[PDB]
């Protein structure tokens, strides 16, 4: 999935590093992070 539901500061090329039990934690929608 693209930035279709990820935080407004994250990329799938740095979120696919997470288990399926955290895929659901970032696809939830967050802030205070900017992939930088």
């Amino acid at each position: 999935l693209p930035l279709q539901a990820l935080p407004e500061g994250v990329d799938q090329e740095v979120f696919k590093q997470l288990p399926a039990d955290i895929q659901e934690e970032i696809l939830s929608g967050k802030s205070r992070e900017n992939l930088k």
């Binding site: 590093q17 997470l18 967050k30 992070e33």
Partner: protein
């Protein structure tokens, strides 16, 4: 002895631990380094999430083994 816990932002922090400084101890190593509480961290290794009821020895973690981390904002 130390490890490298990389964040959800692709940056890593060097941290000193022991095979007995289990996850609830490690959360203080990351809190000390940035101020992030144990209630908002989310630590991973070899691609799985550790637990506060284990030990670094229960997951064979050693020096320079490299780990991963995610965080939250409590809600605001």
């Amino acid at each position: 002895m130390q490890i490298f816990v990389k964040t959800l932002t692709g940056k890593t922090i060097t941290l000193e631990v022991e095979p007995s400084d289990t996850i609830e101890n490690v959360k203080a190593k990351i809190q000390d380094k940035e101020g992030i509480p144990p209630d908002q961290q989310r630590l991973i290794f070899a691609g799985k999430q550790l637990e506060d009821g284990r030990t670094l020895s229960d997951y064979n973690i050693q020096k320079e083994s490299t780990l991963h981390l995610v965080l939250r904002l409590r809600g605001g």
